[PDB]
Scaffold this active site. Structure first.
Site, PDB file in Angstrom:
ATOM      1  N   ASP A  35       5.796 -13.931   5.946  1.00 33.38           N
ATOM      2  CA  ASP A  35       5.806 -12.470   6.034  1.00 33.38           C
ATOM      3  C   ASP A  35       7.100 -11.856   5.517  1.00 33.38           C
ATOM      4  O   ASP A  35       8.124 -11.845   6.217  1.00 33.38           O
ATOM      5  CB  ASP A  35       5.567 -12.040   7.486  1.00 33.38           C
ATOM      6  CG  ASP A  35       5.529 -10.546   7.663  1.00 33.38           C
ATOM      7  OD1 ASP A  35       5.427  -9.834   6.655  1.00 33.38           O
ATOM      8  OD2 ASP A  35       5.626 -10.093   8.825  1.00 33.38           O
ATOM      9  N   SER A 199       7.947   2.270  -6.726  1.00 32.67           N
ATOM     10  CA  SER A 199       6.975   2.199  -7.807  1.00 32.67           C
ATOM     11  C   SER A 199       7.092   3.457  -8.648  1.00 32.67           C
ATOM     12  O   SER A 199       7.397   4.515  -8.117  1.00 32.67           O
ATOM     13  CB  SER A 199       5.558   2.082  -7.239  1.00 32.67           C
ATOM     14  OG  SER A 199       4.602   2.196  -8.280  1.00 32.67           O
TER      15      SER A 199
HETATM   16  O1  LIG Z   1       0.922  -5.619  11.579  1.00 34.66           O
HETATM   17  C1  LIG Z   1       1.090  -5.889  10.390  1.00 34.66           C
HETATM   18  N1  LIG Z   1       1.301  -4.940   9.463  1.00 34.66           N
HETATM   19  C2  LIG Z   1       1.010  -3.533   9.743  1.00 34.66           C
HETATM   20  C3  LIG Z   1      -0.476  -3.268   9.534  1.00 34.66           C
HETATM   21  C4  LIG Z   1      -0.817  -1.803   9.774  1.00 34.66           C
HETATM   22  C5  LIG Z   1       0.014  -0.900   8.894  1.00 34.66           C
HETATM   23  C6  LIG Z   1       1.491  -1.152   9.115  1.00 34.66           C
HETATM   24  C7  LIG Z   1       1.847  -2.618   8.872  1.00 34.66           C
HETATM   25  N2  LIG Z   1       1.290  -7.143   9.965  1.00 34.66           N
HETATM   26  C8  LIG Z   1       0.910  -8.239  10.835  1.00 34.66           C
HETATM   27  C9  LIG Z   1      -0.535  -8.647  10.547  1.00 34.66           C
HETATM   28  O2  LIG Z   1      -1.449  -7.580  10.796  1.00 34.66           O
HETATM   29  C10 LIG Z   1      -1.010  -9.834  11.400  1.00 34.66           C
HETATM   30  N3  LIG Z   1      -2.465 -10.232  11.059  1.00 34.66           N
HETATM   31  C11 LIG Z   1      -2.786 -11.638  11.488  1.00 34.66           C
HETATM   32  C12 LIG Z   1      -4.281 -11.844  11.549  1.00 34.66           C
HETATM   33  C13 LIG Z   1      -4.981 -11.188  10.376  1.00 34.66           C
HETATM   34  C14 LIG Z   1      -4.021 -10.949   9.234  1.00 34.66           C
HETATM   35  C15 LIG Z   1      -2.885 -10.025   9.632  1.00 34.66           C
HETATM   36  C16 LIG Z   1       0.049 -10.945  11.112  1.00 34.66           C
HETATM   37  O3  LIG Z   1       0.878 -11.137  12.230  1.00 34.66           O
HETATM   38  C17 LIG Z   1       1.940 -10.174  12.103  1.00 34.66           C
HETATM   39  C18 LIG Z   1       1.721  -9.524  10.743  1.00 34.66           C
HETATM   40  O4  LIG Z   1       0.912 -10.522  10.081  1.00 34.66           O
END
Ligand SMILES: O=C(NC1CCCCC1)N[C@H]1[C@H](O)[C@@H](N2CCCCC2)[C@@H]2OC[C@H]1O2
Length: 330
Positions: A35, A199
């Site tokens: 990440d 961008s």
């Molecule tokens: O929360 C976000 N990003 C936000 C999304 C909404 C808009 C603002 C940013 N990233 C997370 C992500 O959703 C998780 N998830 C795992 C299972 C399915 C795949 C993704 C994973 O765990 C932490 C990280 O990656």
């Protein structure tokens, strides 16, 4: 030194990508979500509340001869999707694709939120944003990349995510066979702790390019592309029957649609996201309403070039003294 590891989608939609990581001695291999939008390396562990573990592979520090409690250290993180985890900290040997860091902070989860428990395919996260975002207290810890940097042939890593297919993370070198044309580099601001860049604009399908500065973060840990409401409206206006649904939580479109491409600017260069990359399938099993891969950032506070955008490119995360970001078509 260098490292190279394959990263694999967790499901048929490319909701996220997992990369095997070796922790401890003897090695314990966990599949982590790399990440570039966070800076904690945390894992499901022998310390995770038992009811909160469902199918994940756990790290057991007591079985590692190189594990050492980082005494007094704790961590706690919340992500943008509302998920969270917390716990204590060990240092141990961590290897990715042949690249080894000794004394890496491995954050052991005592608690994880339900979304993590419910996803058996992700055993933790490996943060690759700037170490200033690391949540370990009272002594902030460095990312895997930050620790590896000085040993690497070149202080870079690259993300080459596949569309409905595996891809690659490389550390310390640029694979010149992995992309077409040239790599366009663009300035990064580290002020917020992200790989934040601007961008130069966008186009929808075969439409004319709109020159406009769009500040956002390159975020491998976010599935979708989140952009200003103006831009997102212009995109979905080209799809018959598409609409923003507050009940679903974003733009949905008829599963019978053919989606147009979306182009974003990197300096004078252009990365084209094919229409198919923007299809995230039925909102529920059997539904004829599909979830869009381009969504509004209005309620987030920052634009996010997540996987939908990044997978269309070969992306260089250049961690030189003045960091920069590079994008090439592939
Ligand atoms: O929360 C976000 N990003 C936000 C999304 C909404 C808009 C603002 C940013 N990233 C997370 C992500 O959703 C998780 N998830 C795992 C299972 C399915 C795949 C993704 C994973 O765990 C932490 C990280 O990656």
């Amino acid at each position: 030194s260098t490292g190279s590891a394959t990263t694999t989608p967790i499901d048929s939609l490319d909701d996220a990508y997992i990369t095997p990581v070796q922790i401890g001695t003897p090695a314990q291999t966990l599949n982590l979500d790399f990440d570039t939008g966070s800076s904690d390396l945390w894992v499901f562990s022998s310390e995770t509340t038992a009811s909160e573990v469902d199918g994940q592979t756990i790290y057991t520090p007591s079985k590692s001869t190189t594990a050492k409690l980082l005494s007094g250290a704790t961590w706690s993180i919340s992500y943008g999707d509302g998920s969270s985890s917390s716990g204590d900290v060990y240092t141990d040997t961590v290897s990715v694709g042949g690249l080894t860091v000794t004394g890496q902070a491995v954050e052991s989860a005592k608690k994880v939120s339900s979304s993590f428990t419910e996803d058996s395919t992700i055993d933790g996260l490996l943060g690759l944003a700037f170490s200033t975002l690391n949540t370990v207290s009272p002594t902030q810890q460095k990312t895997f990349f930050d620790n590896a940097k000085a040993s690497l042939d070149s202080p870079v890593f690259t993300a080459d995510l596949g569309y409905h297919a595996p891809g690659t993370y490389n550390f310390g070198f640029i694979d010149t066979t992995a992309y077409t044309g040239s790599i366009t580099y663009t300035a990064v601001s580290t002020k917020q702790g992200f790989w934040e860049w601007t961008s130069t604009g966008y186009a929808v399908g075969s439409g004319t390019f709109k020159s406009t500065s769009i500040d956002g973060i390159a975020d491998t840990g976010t599935t979708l592309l989140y952009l200003p409401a103006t831009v997102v409206s212009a995109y979905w206006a080209q799809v018959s029957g598409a609409k923003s649904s507050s009940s679903v939580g974003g733009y949905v479109f008829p599963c019978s649609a053919t989606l147009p491409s979306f182009t974003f600017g990197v300096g004078s260069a252009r990365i084209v996201i094919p229409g198919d990359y923007i299809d995230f399938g039925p909102i529920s099993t059997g539904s004829s309403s599909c979830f869009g891969g381009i969504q509004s950032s209005a309620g987030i506070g920052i634009n996010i070039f997540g996987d939908v955008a990044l997978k269309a490119a070969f992306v260089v995360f250049n961690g030189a003294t003045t960091p920069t970001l590079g994008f090439a078509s592939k």
